[PDB]
DNA sequence: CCGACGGCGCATCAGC
DNA sequence: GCTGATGCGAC
DNA sequence: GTCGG
């Protein structure tokens, strides 16, 4: 919050340019650049002075000027006023509705949450969840309820098979004091790059969590993701906790760093690493690190017996978690 | 210039 | 039914 | 929107 106000600025123009121009890489800039003044350790005077950062070029620098001088944009003023934006822009904030749907929504005169709550026989599953929490899914997880839950999806996983391991990731991982949803890396070893000897393997956990009522709802569910709902249990008397997104990846055994560098995080964190991974030669996933060769054409999957191997391929510094929130 | 911009699982639909 | 393109996802 | 070559 060093300069809250600028990376405020950014946020809402990378928003805008997602959901209602469908400008994806204009999305992209505008959070590489929210995110390289997010970590610039003075508070920013000038335009100037941010266009010496990578990633803030000559027309965010114009912006950083207009708003340092009057405290806003005119830009973001007049967005705020269009109806149209207006209402693309909130009905993305629903769990389920994309841009494109947004807007078609628009086009049908369903604008509003009273809107979706009337038609929500236009809704597809995974939208008529996201409306049914809308409010829920908006609240931050206070780090201690990631404590909790965590718990009961260890214990719960154990319950099911001694043998899987489940790691909790995202901004938890990198020890962010509060997260937006619970995200859970599964393996088993059952389940490798060589083979798969179980079937089954992330239904079980799912249903486990279910008949234990931790899980509520479904948005998305095959073989290796799932994406749903969670609640914490509540004592007598007590208000309930909201509901809470989770989502689950069964990640091959032998892939397992591969697959924590991924789910840790942060995406602008993974671009970055994967984009200069790019550069050296090399294309990372959540799976494996290969080569590229002359051709372009990835290779055989290099050894990785630990997070730092694939960060020395690409000759970066080992990064801890806590330093990837970008 | 201007081409590139990380990478992929699940849901839903068009075309056969 | 299958395959491939598209939306969605913090995307 | 920004960057590299
Ligand atoms: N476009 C994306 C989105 C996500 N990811 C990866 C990194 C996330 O940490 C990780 C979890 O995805 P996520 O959406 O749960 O993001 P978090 O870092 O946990 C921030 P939160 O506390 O949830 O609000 O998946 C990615 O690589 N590329
Ligand atoms: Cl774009
Ligand atoms: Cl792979
Ligand atoms: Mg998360
Ligand atoms: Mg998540
Ligand atoms: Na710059
Ligand atoms: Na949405």
Sequence with gaps: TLNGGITDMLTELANFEKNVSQAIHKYNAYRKAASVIAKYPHKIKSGAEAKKLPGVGTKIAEKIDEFL??????????????????????????????????????????????????????????????????????????REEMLQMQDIVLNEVKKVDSEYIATVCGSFRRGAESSGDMDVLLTHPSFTSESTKQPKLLHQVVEQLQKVHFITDTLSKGETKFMGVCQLPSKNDEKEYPHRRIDIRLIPKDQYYCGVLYFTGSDIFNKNMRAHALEKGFTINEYTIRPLGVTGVAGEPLPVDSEKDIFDYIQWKYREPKDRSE
């Design 69 to 142: 001088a009057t405290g806003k944009l005119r830009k973001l003023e007049k967005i705020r006023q269009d109806d149209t934006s207006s209402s693309i822009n909130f009905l993305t904030r629903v769990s389920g509705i994309g841009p494109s749907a947004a807007r078609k929504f628009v086009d049908e005169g369903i604008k509003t949450l009273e809107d979706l709550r009337k038609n929500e026989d236009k809704l597809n599953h995974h939208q008529r969840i996201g409306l049914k929490y809308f409010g829920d899914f908006e609240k931050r997880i206070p």
